Ligand binder design. Structure first.
Ligand code: NAG
Lengths: 49, 48, 126
C-alpha cells in the first residue's frame, strides 16, 4: 500500500493503434566545448579547371 | 606539444654509430600526427 | 525458453517441502515469477508471485504465513517453501513466468502468464 514499482511495461502489439504503436526516436544534440570541433560535414568538392 | 587542444607529434628517424652520446649535426623533424584531443597535459612518462 | 520444475512429491501433514523452478534458454528480461496449483476437478488457482527486481512477494490468502516464495537471480530459479502442509495443499503445482512489468505487485495474482512449467505433484498424507 502506497509502495509501488516505479517502472511499467509498454503494450506493443501489431494490432495496436498508431498512437499506442512503438516508435523509435533519436535526439541529436550538438556540443561546442573548449576543444577542437571534430564532427564536420561533407563540403562536397567541384571539378578542376 | 599540445596547443589549443591539438596534440602535435613530429618525428624523425636516422642511422647513427654513436653509443656514447647524442650526434652533433642538424636534422629537421617532419610532422606525423595531429590529434584533436582537447585534453589537458602537464605530466608524461615513457614505456619500454 | 523452458521452465523446469522439481521437488515436491509426498509429505505427511505438518511437514515442509520445497519446489524449484529453473528458467533455461535465452531470456531478454524477467518481470516476475509465480506459482499456481490445480487440485483434481478444481480450477487452477494463484499461490504466490515474486518480482524479479527487488524480490517483493504477493501471496494467496490460503497460503499466507505457511508458504514462502523466493528467487535466485544468478541461478534463474524461483522456489516455493511449503511449510505446515495441509490436505488442501494436495495439487499439481505450476511455475509461471512473465516479462510484463506492472507498477502494482497485486496484478501478478490475476495477470495471464506467458510461460508455464510442466507441473509437479504435491501429495499431503495423514
Ligand atoms: C587545465 O589546466 C589549466 C592550467 O592549470 C587549468 O586552469 C584548468 O583548470 C585545467 N582544466 C582541466 C580540464 O582540469
Amino acid at each position: 500500500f502506497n509502495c509501488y514499482f516505479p517502472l511499467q511495461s509498454y503494450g506493443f502489439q501489431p494490432t495496436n493503434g498508431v498512437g499506442y504503436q512503438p516508435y523509435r526516436v533519436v535526439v541529436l544534440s550538438f556540443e561546442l566545448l573548449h576543444a577542437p570541433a571534430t564532427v564536420c560535414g561533407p563540403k562536397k568538392s567541384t571539378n578542376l579547371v | 606539444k599540445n596547443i589549443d587542444g591539438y596534440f602535435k607529434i613530429y618525428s624523425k628517424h636516422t642511422p647513427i654509430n654513436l653509443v656514447r652520446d647524442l650526434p652533433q649535426g642538424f636534422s629537421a623533424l617532419e610532422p606525423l600526427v595531429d590529434l584533436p584531443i582537447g585534453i589537458n597535459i602537464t605530466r608524461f612518462q615513457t614505456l619500454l | 525458453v523452458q521452465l523446469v520444475e522439481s521437488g515436491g512429491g509426498l509429505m505427511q501433514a505438518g511437514g515442509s517441502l520445497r519446489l524449484s523452478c529453473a528458467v533455461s534458454g535465452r531470456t531478454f528480461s524477467t518481470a516476475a515469477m509465480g506459482w499456481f496449483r490445480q487440485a483434481p476437478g478444481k480450477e487452477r488457482e494463484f499461490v504466490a508471485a515474486i518480482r524479479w527486481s527487488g524480490g517483493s512477494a504477493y501471496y494467496a490468502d490460503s497460503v499466507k504465513g505457511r508458504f514462502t516464495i523466493s528467487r535466485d537471480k544468478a541461478k534463474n530459479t524461483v522456489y516455493l517453501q511449503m511449510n505446515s502442509l495441509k490436505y488442501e495443499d494436495t495439487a499439481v503445482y505450476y511455475c509461471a513466468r512473465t516479462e510484463y512489468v506492472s507498477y502494482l505487485l497485486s496484478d501478478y495474482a490475476t495477470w495471464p502468464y506467458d510461460y508455464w512449467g510442466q507441473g509437479t505433484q504435491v501429495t499431503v498424507s495423514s
